[model samples]
Target: MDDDHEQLVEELEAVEAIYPDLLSKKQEDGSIIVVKVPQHEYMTLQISFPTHYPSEEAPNVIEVGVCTSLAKRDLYDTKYLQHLFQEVMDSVFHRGSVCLFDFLTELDGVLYVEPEEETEPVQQSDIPTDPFEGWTASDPITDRGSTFMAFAAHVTSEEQAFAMLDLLKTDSKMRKANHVMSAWRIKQDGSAATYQDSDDDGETAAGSRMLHLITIMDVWNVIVVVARWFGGAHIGPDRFKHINSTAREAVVRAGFDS
Candidate 1:
């Protein structure tokens, strides 16, 4: 937890260093920063850190608004501002790093432009309002200082499954892991139609092996991601054992395996 605080403090200092005059207030849980929206007036965003931020969780954007003046607000309506903040949050977290600096840069890039020609908006389904909002995770299985963990989600579309996996990169631990393998099996309602696939994420066939686990368990309409943090020493085939077990546990925890 101290590490989380240290990361947050370091990021706060970096942001404050770059925009010393923009910070309006610093609270126990968050900071409020005044961001210039380029063609528009200044706007404020209140960002609060979760207990496990940058590791197990992403920071929160609690509030946003124009500096004042209803006319200035009309420049970028509330709905537009909300979507802008959400997009910035998604982009920053997607990189799985200390994000305040990048968040500001990404936000400025989008809001700096004219409203009529906004940058390509992120698809609603691509950037989840809260990535892990409905995910079920397994307890970390650690061996030789290497850790293996799994997260499962009940999903319908192939896009949702992959998007969720992409969003999983938001978690620092998962992003830094040596490998993040994933698999999903979705059963559609038409004549036993099934859509299933896997991603090795550079772990060779580990992804397909996970799909095999899902298949044997008869798990459907679910996506499972198993992230492995490789310790210095190679653990050989035992790694696959850990991955499959955690995947199973995650699927069951997600209630996909009854």
Candidate 2:
């Protein structure tokens, strides 16, 4: 390094060493300045001192943070702060000013400012182990001798509902039932986001009938499977009676409105 450039580092370090809370230390061949960011944990200022300093370039003001008090992003405006500090770095270049005293003094003012408050996030719901927790039921439909069994679980997508249907199909007991009507809906929070679809299995229009029942009940994020074993004695419209009543019981046990 030339005598003029070497002299600048010496002078820069000497003045920087004395500033309060403006910690300066010789790290390897270069020096670093540590400053407290206003309302922040820590911010630092480090420089590159080469021969081009005065005419070609002065110290490059890079980045911040020497301590921490709150979360990150609590104190912003970092880019503008760096820009202002660099502006100071260039201002003292007259006759190749050796030390960065003027730049450091100007920097102290630009580093800190009041931070804005952060917003809080939402909390969890009161219901513990609700419908998404799943539920089951079995009861006599219309007391007409026909047995009805229903299974339900929280399903977020049609694929999830279909997967559940496959499980019910695989189960030995429900696998050969007379009817395996299924229905599911997603998202109770968003009105327009609700999606509902169902299958009748074998009972004609029973899937749509089940969908209509849950719709009136205003249940969300649920999938219901209703199975029946023929009693060999037809109960006429009493079939739908048992279907709706049987499924509603499972939905209620899932924590839906009774």
Candidate 3:
């Protein structure tokens, strides 16, 4: 029980670092935390720990509420909503692990009910059903039991780039990895500002390091993702070296460096 509490506390701190404003209420007693769901005005999640969490069981979504709404839609089916949260919980918590941050990663989309004003899908013709169709991935670099791999893809739009990142999670290895950091730089036609972004994914500056790699390589219209699987050993600063090397290799292999 004590071990589980420590794990919960660490996971809570991890999620808060990534999402500064999403958490609205946190119990000082360390028993519960409430997160205000993003992309919706009416949803809040009341989460709590199990006695044997991160070891024998998963955390609980003790309550889901609409803090300020009477708006109802077909998407509000109670059973269906429960199913969505269940799937996320099962994926995040298993085999003596905790992933509060991972849970928040999908929170925005999981329960987000799109406004009906949105029109039909645009430019569906050129969109690849398989996000990996244009992506080139590097061979894994294993060091000190940690593995690093990178994927490179040519993308013209931010939406296209982000879609690829989201879909990349379909791979089991990518999904379960400790970190799946990414960086993208987009140079659109006649745009005053080039679009670029990176996510650390809990690796602490790893994403920006990849971004710096692409920047110095003079590469644009591309994205690089480096997934690191920590295998019971902490590699310290050398991990960044491996991340940069693998990322560079992927970019070159994909011809993005050309």
Candidate 4:
């Protein structure tokens, strides 16, 4: 291994030593950390750093292959990875700018792998029939509710579901639910938490707050939606129409409306 790869391996070994029970390494092509839970069997943690460092950028630690039986999406999804790295980089390096120097010198923390017990996979009965089986992305049938609803029906977790919500929240033109559902695939897995020594006294502190923030945002979105629907306001026809319109719009924004 080159100097940089050696450094990363040392870091991984250190992490393993610190969390011996929670971590294990493999002699595979990729540097992998396996996290095993009594309920979910095993999940792998893979870290990929930029080829050029300090002179280039800090490496990224990502979680992949989160058992689909646990959650179809892993940590490598763009949206989730973006959120995770942003928090990690911000907390560690000066101004959240990651450089090769930081990786070799200042980085800390074992990326936290959130454990999700495997649940029964979502049933196929819940999925709707594809409305435009013969249509292409450019077809109008691609923008209908049947398309969006069918896609949403396949989502197995609220994590995937909310990632879809964020996608829809950003866009405005697309109108189908299925098209919006595609955004969930962008960040399917999870991310490593950033470690920081907040006290500045040289004592190693915790950097897993990113995980907490992610969890909070996810729960918050769900709460907001549930509260809005359960607030007991009468659903007049006009309001109901608006709700349906908004729902479809949100999905379209998420890319399900293609």
Order candidates by lDDT, high to low: 3, 1, 2, 4
Task: Give per-residue CA lDDT, model 2, range 1-258, as digits (tens).
Answer: 356546655665665455434555545434444444323335665555554654455655566434444565565555756777667766666534543656645554665453555756545321112332233443335335555556667666667766766776677656666667777777656556655666666686887888887778777677667676565444446454655676566657664563
Model 2 ranges with Cα > 4 A deviation: 1-135, 138-142, 191-193, 230-250
List model 3 lDDT by residue over 124-144, tens digit each: 321112235778765355567
| TM-score of predicted structure 2 | 0.37
lDDT of 4 by residue, 147-257 (tens): 222122224345544444444434443331222222222223364332211111111121133224324444211111110112123423333444456555543433443
Best-to-worst ranking by TM-score: 1, 3, 2, 4
Each candidate: RMSD: 17.7, 24.0, 19.0, 25.6
In model 1, where do residues sit more than 4 Å from their true spots?
Answer: 1-131, 169-173, 189-193, 230-250
Clashes of each: 0, 11, 0, 23
How big is the positional error of residue 206 in model 3, measured in Å on the Cα after superposition? 1.3
Q: What is the C-alpha lDDT of each candidate?
A: 0.64, 0.57, 0.66, 0.36
- Where is the poorest 10-residue window by lDDT in model 1? 122-131
Off by over 4 Å in 4: 1-6, 24-44, 53-56, 62-65, 68-82, 93-258
Where does candidate 3 stray beyond 4 Å?
1-131, 169-172, 189-193, 230-250
The TM-score values for the models, in the order shown, are 0.40, 0.37, 0.39, 0.24
